[PDB]
Design a protein around this ligand. Structure first.
Ligand SMILES: [Mg+2]
Ligand SMILES: [Mg+2]
Ligand SMILES: [Mg+2]
Ligand SMILES: [Mg+2]
Ligand SMILES: [Mg+2]
Ligand SMILES: [Mg+2]
Ligand SMILES: [Mg+2]
Ligand SMILES: [Mg+2]
Ligand SMILES: [Mg+2]
Ligand SMILES: [Mg+2]
Ligand SMILES: [Mg+2]
Ligand SMILES: [Mg+2]
Ligand SMILES: [Mg+2]
Ligand SMILES: [Mg+2]
Ligand SMILES: [Mg+2]
Ligand SMILES: [Mg+2]
Ligand SMILES: [Mg+2]
Ligand SMILES: [Mg+2]
Ligand SMILES: [Mg+2]
Lengths: 260, 134, 182
RNA sequence: UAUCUGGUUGAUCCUGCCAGUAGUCAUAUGCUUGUCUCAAAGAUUAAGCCAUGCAUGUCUAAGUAUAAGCAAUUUAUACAGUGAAACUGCGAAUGGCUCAUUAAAUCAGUUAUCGUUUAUUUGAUAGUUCCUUUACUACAUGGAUAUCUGUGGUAAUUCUAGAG
RNA sequence: UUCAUAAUAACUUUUCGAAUCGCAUGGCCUUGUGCUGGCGAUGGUUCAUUCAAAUUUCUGCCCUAUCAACUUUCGAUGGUAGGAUAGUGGCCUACCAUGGUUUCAACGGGUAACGGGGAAUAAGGGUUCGAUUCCGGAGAGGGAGCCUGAGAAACGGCUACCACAUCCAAGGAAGGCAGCAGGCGCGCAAAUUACCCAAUCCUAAUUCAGGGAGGUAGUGACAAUAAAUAACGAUACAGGGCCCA
């Protein structure tokens, strides 16, 4: 009714933030941004709770407005900035660089990376349109647009962005038998090689994905994000190699690691 | 009787505010409470600290006594402290003076008055003068 | 509002309030293990009932199913940690049994009385209430605390307590004063 | 803890229902209430009535400052430091409250927009404006309105006429 | 896809294409105070993007036949054309067609009907309740109509009528507590004209200003949690097994 929703309640919040349901009644609604509200992760949720670099909103504000914080390129003065998938957060202090990549169980794990890989973003191709004058442009999954790409770029393809300039260095063509990342749903953050495509007519297109532990899982192309060749990733993966381990396995791990 | 042993769990260097976020662990057998000022005073040989940039918050006494967990922030400067710390905490410590405004209600009333009127005040005064005369 | 502050009932009241045998049993248990409230017994039974329910559910799922492999095992581990279940007895059938007596025996109220320290259960209760019991270093004034196997040796008088070190109590001071001024 | 007991008879089996019993994250209420952590609370009846007070305003290095306002000392002649006040710019369509409507409507899940609009944020984005196109077009920058100063009118109020 | 886009022909009371701001203040020379040049904020059309928004498809709703046909005057159903709309369409209007829904419950009538998630309830299967912490939706006396704006048919925005009622010097004026407390009234039935923006968070030109949003307490036997109201003492007569009666 009337207009757009400005606030957001600390229960109506997306699950993979793991915010304290009791302390606080409002969550941070991420502002208008590149990624979808459901997929995206705001900075205050990250900075205050994942890293523990702050303890309050005021603290977070202080951290931000002094302009030490940089996301993919620019600083972003606002608190509630949407940072989704594959996004690089470079903090000027101690040069602690991150890429926001999911974990085994679906959380944006604090993955610490050096300036070498934290220089390029991977971006899924949403659509390719010929714009004004007759110019082809490629659309990144983070809303971003790059004008004049490689002509052989289609949808579901993945693209390198050098961050310093809005330019493509290289791309990984969508192929069955190319190592991949899953970004949403019941199966999230798992990694496999893609066995076979299911093309389908009129919406929803599935792909069958197989991991190293011989466990098949089928997922829509919406959540599928190509990382590269089978064997070699283009991005360093979180601890446990980002393979969805069984509950029994987890229990075993717990029972094996009692070290002090 | 007891000199009180202070160790610090979960130590973050924290470069974004130059402060050091750590969990203060106080152990005071026989002694009633920590008394935070004393702890602050102590915190000087611990991290080359000054009684200005030392901050402590939390300090709930654990059940039974003796053990007391808290949370500490040692800044690199007094200046740093007086640009990142909330003012109330500073006031508590004894660094910045107790900031005085008024009662909230009074302020709100003033705001309402301002809203209900237009101008700087001089015009209003003049009008009043004319109403007072006639 | 806030929302997720959920309050659980923790005990079950019996469906028939004057079923005599049951009542007698409860009374006997209270006598044995010093109990202010029948709700304490009821509480423990409710807990046990919950465990039983879980066990039943697990049994319903077939032998060496994933759920059975997980949850049942976890339950067994939990029980071992509390004590209660024997180290030979780790096969779900045992869990289904478990009695009612055992939970009222592996709890501070009884666990203090078990090695001594009190020479009576009511005495033990009083001791627990008045803070002169530590789990190891931490004071517990909960009678139905449930001592947990690893802590089974470290139950002793607190560091800041009479008949366990520290200082004389309120009566001793009075006596001293009297002695001073005679 | 898949449970029942009392009551039709002179006694008996039923059929039955009535009692009791147990719970309420269901009210009210009755006396009694030493504690601790937690904390629902004008929904039900009348979406009935409502006195007063208060619940949306806002400024940075950076849209306007000749407040006849402080400040001024070490930075201040076009201003340079804050900074009320008023315009312009946003925001007041969020939140909060309530359940009278409303029965394939809402709503739930579910598609779709190849059937559309989208301030804002994020990216990208107008080499091409002129008009017979050498006596030409301010681009090394073109014209009047409101804050306050005064005259007020009025039984009054987020009314305000006139002039500069 | 008649898509995107390109290309031609034109067309437009020719939409826009920066007559702005602060901190910086260097490069080279033809020495003009020249041409240059580094960030940073605002602003601006297009296309994506998210926040969305309307619509939308399928499937599912509580009682009643003491509700058997219903809708078509004043669109019911469909066609065709326009109009209107941000866009689709009976969404309007013109004109033709006579359909459409129903006994697999249409249409009526009720409700002590906001819809879910859910809640209570201890086999299984259900029952009954969801006004209420989250999501939708509705409404801001009652109906209506608009304005500004990206975004309302707003309600702490206006406009009128209806009803209830304030202040007046009677000519006129402001109204809307289903925001918070507070009062009246009703009733079985419900709290302080308390304090603070610190936490949570949104809003602003914006770290700084604000927010009875929010939190903190007062009241509080709503329910739930946890547990004190004694603890052992030496005795003085009898137990209960017994060295033997
Ligand atoms: Mg039954
Ligand atoms: Mg008889
Ligand atoms: Mg009955
Ligand atoms: Mg009412
Ligand atoms: Mg204004
Ligand atoms: Mg709302
Ligand atoms: Mg109703
Ligand atoms: Mg048409
Ligand atoms: Mg309902
Ligand atoms: Mg509801
Ligand atoms: Mg009602
Ligand atoms: Mg009303
Ligand atoms: Mg209206
Ligand atoms: Mg409103
Ligand atoms: Mg008004
Ligand atoms: Mg009220
Ligand atoms: Mg009551
Ligand atoms: Mg409130
Ligand atoms: Mg009380």
């Amino acid at each position: 009714a009337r207009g757009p929703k400005k606030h957001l309640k600390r229960l109506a919040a997306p699950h993979h933030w793991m915010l304290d349901k009791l302390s606080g009644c409002y969550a941070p609604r991420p502002s208008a941004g590149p990624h979808k509200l459901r997929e995206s992760l705001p900075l205050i949720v990250f900075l205050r709770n994942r890293l523990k670099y702050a303890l309050n909103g005021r603290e977070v504000k202080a951290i931000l407005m002094q302009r030490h914080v940089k996301v993919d390129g620019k600083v972003r003065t606002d608190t509630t900035f949407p940072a989704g998938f594959m996004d690089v957060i470079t903090l000027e202090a101690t040069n602690e660089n991150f890429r926001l990549v999911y974990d085994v169980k679906g959380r944006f794990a604090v993955h610490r990376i050096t300036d070498e890989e934290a220089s390029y973003k991977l971006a899924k191709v949403k659509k390719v349109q010929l714009g004004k004058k007759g110019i082809p442009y490629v659309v990144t999954h983070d809303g971003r647009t790059i004008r004049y790409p490689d002509p052989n770029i289609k949808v579901n393809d993945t693209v390198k962005v050098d961050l310093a300039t809005g330019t493509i260095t290289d791309f990984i063509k969508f192929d069955t038998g190319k190592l991949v990342y899953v970004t949403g749903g019941r199966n999230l953050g798992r990694v496999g090689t893609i066995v076979h495509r299911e093309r389908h007519e009129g919406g929803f297109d599935l792909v069958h994905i197989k991991d190293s532990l011989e466990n098949t899982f089928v997922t829509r192309l919406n959540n599928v994000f190509v990382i590269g060749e089978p064997g070699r990733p283009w991005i360093s993966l979180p601890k446990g190699k980002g393979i969805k381990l069984t509950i029994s396995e987890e229990r075993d791990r717990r029972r094996a690691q009692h070290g002090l | 009787s007891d000199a009180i042993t202070i160790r610090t769990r979960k130590v973050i260097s924290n470069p974004l505010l130059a402060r050091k976020q750590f969990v203060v662990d106080v152990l005071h057998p026989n002694r009633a409470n920590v008394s935070k000022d004393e702890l602050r005073e102590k915190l000087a040989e611990a991290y080359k600290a000054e009684k200005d940039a030392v901050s402590v918050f939390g300090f709930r006494t654990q059940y039974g006594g003796g053990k007391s967990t808290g949370f500490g922030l040692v800044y690199n400067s007094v200046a740093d402290a007086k640009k990142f710390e909330p003012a109330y905490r500073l006031v508590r410590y004894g660094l910045a003076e107790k900031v005085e405004k008024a009662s909230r209600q009074q302020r709100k009333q003033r705001k309402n008055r301002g809203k209900k009127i237009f101008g700087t005040g001089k015009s209003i005064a003049k009008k009043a003068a004319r109403r007072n005369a006639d | 509002p806030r929302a997720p502050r959920t309050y659980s009932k923790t005990y079950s009241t019996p469906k028939r309030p004057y079923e005599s045998a049951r009542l007698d049993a409860e009374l006997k248990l209270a006598g044995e293990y010093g109990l202010k409230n029948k709700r304490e017994i009821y509480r423990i039974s409710f807990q046990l009932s919950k465990i039983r329910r879980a066990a039943r559910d697990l049994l319903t799922r077939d032998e060496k199913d994933p759920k059975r492999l997980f949850e049942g095992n976890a339950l067994i581990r939990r029980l071992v940690r509390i004590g209660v279940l024997s180290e030979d007895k780790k096969k779900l059938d045992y869990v289904l049994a478990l009695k009612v007596e055992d939970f009222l025996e592996r709890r501070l109220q009884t666990q203090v009385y078990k090695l001594g320290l009190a020479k009576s259960v009511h005495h033990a209760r009083v001791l627990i209430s008045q803070r002169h019991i530590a789990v190891g270093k931490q004071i517990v004034n909960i009678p139905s605390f449930m001592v947990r196997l690893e802590s089974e040796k470290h139950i002793d008088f607190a560091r800041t307590s009479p008949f366990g070190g520290a200082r004389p109590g309120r009566v001793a001071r009075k006596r001293a004063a009297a002695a001073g001024g005679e």
